[PDB]
């Protein structure tokens, strides 16, 4: 480019709307807020979820359940992702994490049975779905728990 002929990508930048700058714009005078009432006032409007005094929806409904302190979330890997490795590879959490197949380990790798595994692999993971274990063993490979 040249600094004297700069041009933004078409549709990347719009002009901001400036209210209360005359009648021609279509937002003169009342600046698009209509006439009077709480919504037209500076700082105005009721708080989110407020229904003008009708009991709000959240308060009408019951709280449900609890949160487990000891909740475990596994990094799930479906069979389709294991298909990307080389044949006879020892697939591990550390390799999965290093290759970028998983972003975060959390409580461990769990292998799940979505998709198809052609390649023979020694998969070492914390958990397997019953499907996934079967599918790994059916492809010739091994499903070691670690």
Partner RNA sequence: GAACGAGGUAGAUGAAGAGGUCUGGAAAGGCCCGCCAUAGGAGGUAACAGCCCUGUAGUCAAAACUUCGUUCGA
Partner RNA sequence: GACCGAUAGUGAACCAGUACCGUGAGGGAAAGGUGAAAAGCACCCCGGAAGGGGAGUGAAAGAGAUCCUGAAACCGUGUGCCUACAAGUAGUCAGAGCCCGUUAACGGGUGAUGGCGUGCCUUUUGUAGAAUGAACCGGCGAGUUACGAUCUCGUGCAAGGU
Partner RNA sequence: GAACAGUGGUAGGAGAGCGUUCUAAGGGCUGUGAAGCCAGACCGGAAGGACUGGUGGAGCGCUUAGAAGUGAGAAUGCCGG
Site of interaction with another protein (CB under 8 A): 1-3, 6-9, 12
8 binds RNA (CB under 7 A): yes
Q: Considering CB distances under 5 to 8 angstroms, the limit depending on partner class, which of Mg ion, K ion, another protein, none binds residue 9?
A: another protein
Kindly report the backbone phi and psi dihedral angles of residue 44, in degrees, each rounded to the nearest multiple of 5, phi listed first.
-80, -175
Provide the mask over 27-46, with x wherever binding to Mg ion is found by CB under 5 A and - wherever it is not.
-------x-xx-x-------
99 binds Mg ion (CB under 5 A): no
CB nearer to Mg ion: pick between 28 and 115: 28
10 binds RNA (CB under 7 A): yes
CB nearer to another protein: pick between 13 and 35: 13
Q: Considering CB distances under 5 to 8 angstroms, the limit depending on partner class, which of RNA, K ion, another protein, none binds residue 21?
A: RNA
Q: Considering CB distances under 5 to 8 angstroms, the limit depending on partner class, which of K ion, RNA, Mg ion, none binds residue 39?
A: Mg ion
Q: What token pair was written down for 116?
A: 């198809």
- Buried b / exposed e over 26-63, threshold 16 CB at 10 Å, is ebeeeeebeeeeeeeeeeeeeeeeeeeeeeeeeeeeee
Size of the chain in residues = 146
CB nearer to Mg ion: pick between 50 and 88: 50
Provide, rounded to whole angstroms, the least separation between the CB of residue 2 and another protein: 7
Binding site residues, RNA, CB under 7 A: 2-22, 24-36, 40, 81, 84, 100-101, 103
């Amino acid at each position: 480019m040249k600094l004297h002929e700069l041009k933004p990508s078409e549709g990347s930048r719009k002009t901001r709307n400036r209210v209360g700058r005359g009648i021609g714009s279509g937002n003169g005078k009342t600046a698009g807020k209509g006439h009077k009432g709480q919504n037209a006032r500076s700082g105005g409007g009721v708080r989110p979820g407020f229904e003008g005094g009708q009991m709000p929806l959240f308060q009408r409904l019951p709280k449900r359940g609890f949160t487990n302190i000891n909740r475990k979330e596994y990094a799930v890997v479906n069979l389709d992702k294991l298909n990307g490795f080389a044949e006879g590879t020892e697939v591990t959490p550390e390799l999965l994490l290093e290759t970028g197949v998983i972003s975060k380990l959390n409580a461990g790798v769990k292998i799940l049975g979505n998709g198809k595994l052609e390649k023979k692999l020694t998969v070492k993971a914390n958990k397997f779905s019953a499907s996934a274990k079967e599918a790994v063993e059916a492809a010739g490979g091994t499903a070691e728990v670690i």
